[PDB]
Symmetry: D3
């Protein structure tokens, strides 16, 4: 549901004094190859929340080249015993790929909160419809790592309940 792009690219000007839907852009003539790579995932999680989750975000706020292009990827690492609590992504679907460890991944539908839940091991994909309450719990040994691909440059994230 992100607005369609009206040109090739439009790098977010993160220090603009203006506020618009999304971000104003830098001069596209000034873009270089370096603007289209993002290397943030090379930094390991620097900490975890009280529930054992670290999220490393890659939205247009972190990766200016994502502006207008409709995509986000977030890396989630769960300590042993860690969980996400109940969360939503208000403005995007989330396609989860497990890459390390083992997790319980589930979402609740809008039909009396019917729960669709599966155990994921590395390689597994799990799709979360937009805005629906979901969770991840680490059920394996060591850390669990998964990547969420979302169809918005800024899906948003909200903690909705605790466990």
């Amino acid at each position: 549901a992100d607005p369609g792009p009206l040109q090739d690219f439009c790098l977010a000007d993160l220090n603009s004094p203006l506020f618009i839907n999304g971000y104003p852009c830098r001069n596209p003539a000034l873009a270089t190859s370096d603007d289209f790579i993002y290397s943030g995932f090379k930094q390991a999680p620097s900490g975890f929340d009280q529930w054992g989750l670290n999220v490393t975000f890659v939205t247009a706020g972190q990766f200016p080249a994502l502006n207008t292009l409709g995509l986000t990827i977030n890396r989630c690492v769960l300590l042993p015993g860690g969980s996400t609590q109940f969360r939503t992504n208000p403005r995007a679907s989330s396609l989860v790929m497990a890459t390390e460890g083992e997790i319980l991944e589930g979402f609740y539908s809008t039909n009396d909160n019917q729960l669709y839940v599966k155990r994921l091991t590395p390689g597994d994909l799990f799709i979360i419809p937009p805005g629906l309450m979901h969770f991840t719990v680490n059920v394996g040994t060591g850390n669990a790592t998964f990547y969420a691909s979302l169809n918005s440059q800024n899906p948003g994230g909200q903690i909705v309940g605790l466990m």
Copy 2:
């Protein structure tokens, strides 16, 4: 640019005799937890094209639960010396994450085909705007693996 969903989910009925924009759906009341997991990536590449590329596709055609939900992920594995050739994804952006090996990833803009190209190592991301000509070359020692996340259930792919 995928049409927005008008309900929670709508699993593609791949055996329907009808043809519509996207796919007709199975009865949502019959959907189970098993319908929202996809395990295709656990199968290693079974072969490679003449250029050393294997693509393992996860569109709504392979993962029915993606129907109406606007996302695709593809796994690409390149043998040493492998290349993707020049390709487009006509109907989606592509966000590439390198996970193994090292690649050259680039795309051409519509302004005299200016080339934006970078070396990617595991962890790096590279964004290809929708429809733009792009390529990947394996410049590392072993196999290169990267995943393309696309904002369509069926972005399409074309060698140009």
Copy 3:
């Protein structure tokens, strides 16, 4: 974010054996004036949930002419002491109009769940961004009534927390 209409109207065929995004339609040549009125709100709430809320829904599931046209209105009645609990509308904004009694209406943003809350009396409007956790509490005398206008034929509704 509802798909745009590709013709004047497309009345939901609610007894179709097919399932598609949205609803298949009846033959538009068979539509009559009666198909574009909906009188469900003339029935008073027939009951309330354990927390004192009655919702009378008008989505495309109840009002076939809404199919493809991107709108829903729901009537909410709260008994004295009643509340909605914490809820989301996953796929639409919600514009609330209070018409009877007095309510506390609020939503939480995705920025550390900052709460935006106001007391509403009849005539007041309050806008809930899409997918964001929100609530209504009856703080007046007697029943509270408000109408939610949503920009989807089927916004969805999910109870996300209790109070």
Copy 4:
């Protein structure tokens, strides 16, 4: 058909010197609870046009918090004998709810202007597809009041 929002909210800066599709926004960090309520409907109609209609508008121009969020509600009050004349909402559907009095509400399709018209009494809803010519006539004894919910922050209005 309103562009999707790219953040939680984006209050219209109505005093901006810039002009863009929609409105530039105020700093979201400065938004308060007061920004998400609108109390304009507490003012009764201050006057009526020659045809006995008063419209009290709530678009993003009046209610800045509606900016990017895709909704509008307008209150229409018709004096006895009043009428709206033939009008369109070019960029949105209109879902009409009658709340006081009795009205004739109708719209014309694009198929030889077939007329779909119904009598509405309080509680009734009537849906007008986007852009289609429509009208309301007061057929009751007192004032008629109805609210139009539209799926745009700025649907537009035109007498045709």
Copy 5:
């Protein structure tokens, strides 16, 4: 505002008994090159309305390959003294190109119907925003021909006034 296509093409099955938003499609495997050409404009206008206008329509109803692809072209020919009356295209912009003769082309805005009117000679373009009341009158000698490009497979057309 047409829904985005979810595949390469989707030729309208005009003989389907089903009704959905837009059209159900033929088997894309059966599509041939001939399905993507439309030659209706080789037919001259066969008649004119009360007022001297002939419209030759190319929507998805006439050109099945337009289904899901978001475009329509209409050819309009005006006899001497002919006019369109006041009309709207409810669901699309219209980009008019004059190719023969001379016309007065105008639309009214929603701001108290301010009139934007220009007269066009062959080669000229004039843009009509979506849904806005507009008209064209033949002000030259002989026939006037112009083509309307619209960003919908089925923009719709309505006479709204009589001029």
Copy 6:
């Protein structure tokens, strides 16, 4: 896929120092009738590329009134023996109308590049789905002229192969 317009019109301010998705706009109160006509097609092609193609562009970059309104028209003239090479329009469908001369027009699908090719004479239409590789070659005598209608204010254009 162009973002929907949020007002009647929004003429591109091409002299703005700002960069956003699309274009910032001039004050709509200053717009006049002349802002909605574009006469660029009155200029004949001033030159041709290596290969005998001239494109006269009418995007929002040339015709500011197209901004937010979702349409573009391009005129293409091919010298004898001329061709476009393999090209894409990344962000729009293209509806081609041949008006002078004779052309071979084709596009390749994403299904192993199956070729859909037709030859066109004046009046014929041919639809190119968005982003798909396509070409036109002049196969008649003299100049060939066709107009491309695209459902974007800035579809973009890319040479993808050399034929």
